């Protein structure tokens, strides 16, 4: 219905899963994909392959909205960030910027205890 | 050094807005302490950003 030419891609990468969300500016969502949705159940969610396939799914869905240039923001550690941004370019989008925006506390709340494995 | 010398203050700030260690610029310790104090005062006065 709505036509948008430029948008933002948010990548939430962790040690367990990666989420790719396509939004317009001002922060309204358009489409989103995840490793769990494209199979890769369980431990497989963290592999770069799942990240790349999820990114391709998200880009293909956004092309229906019909935008070409997007800005990429990466938040979180974990593999598949570079794979995800590469896949977004591979769908033929023009990336306008790519930034690292993981939040950092100024010595705030106490973290959980260390694991004795 | 005072908090009004914004140009010299930015001379010792990275692009993220963080203070540069004295190892990188060869500054003396006494000057570095005053520099950090002035940088924090300027941040509070909002002449320079906290982050970015």
């Amino acid at each position: 219905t709505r036509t948008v030419s430029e948008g933002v891609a948010h990548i939430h990468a962790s040690f367990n899963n990666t989420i790719v969300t396509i939004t317009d500016r001002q922060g309204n969502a358009l489409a989103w994909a995840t490793s769990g949705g494209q199979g890769f159940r369980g431990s497989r969610k963290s592999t770069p392959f799942a990240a790349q396939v999820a990114a391709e799914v998200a880009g293909k869905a956004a092309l229906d909205y019909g935008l070409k240039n997007l800005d990429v923001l990466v938040k979180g550690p974990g593999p598949g960030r570079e794979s995800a941004v590469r896949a977004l370019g591979a769908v033929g989008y023009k990336i306008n910027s790519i930034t690292d925006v993981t939040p950092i506390p100024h010595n705030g709340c106490r973290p959980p205890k260390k694991r004795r494995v | 050094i005072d908090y009004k010398d914004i140009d010299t203050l930015k001379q010792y700030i990275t692009e993220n807005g963080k203070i540069v260690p004295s190892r990188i610029t060869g500054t003396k310790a006494r000057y570095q302490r005053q520099l950090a104090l002035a940088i924090k005062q300027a941040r509070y006065l909002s002449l320079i950003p906290y982050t970015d």
Binding site: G76, V85, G89, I98, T99, D100, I104, R110, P112, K113 | -
Partner: protein
């Protein structure tokens, strides 16, 4: 960061440049440190060992 793009900059080269910028910023190191809580005793021991290693490196590079 904010890795903006030239007209001729390829996606792969842009991503490599962005990786270099993130590694220079060292945000992931702070993210890793924030994950688990470290006792002040452990922090002091780690810093003492790091200082010893740095002084040994300086002595080795001087002589």
């Amino acid at each position: 960061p904010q890795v903006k793009l030239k007209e001729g900059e390829p996606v792969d080269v842009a991503i490599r440049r962005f990786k270099r910028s993130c590694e220079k910023a060292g945000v992931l190191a702070d993210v890793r440190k924030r994950e688990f809580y470290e006792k002040p005793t452990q922090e002091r021991k780690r810093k003492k060992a790091a200082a010893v290693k740095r002084y040994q490196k300086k002595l080795a590079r001087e002589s």
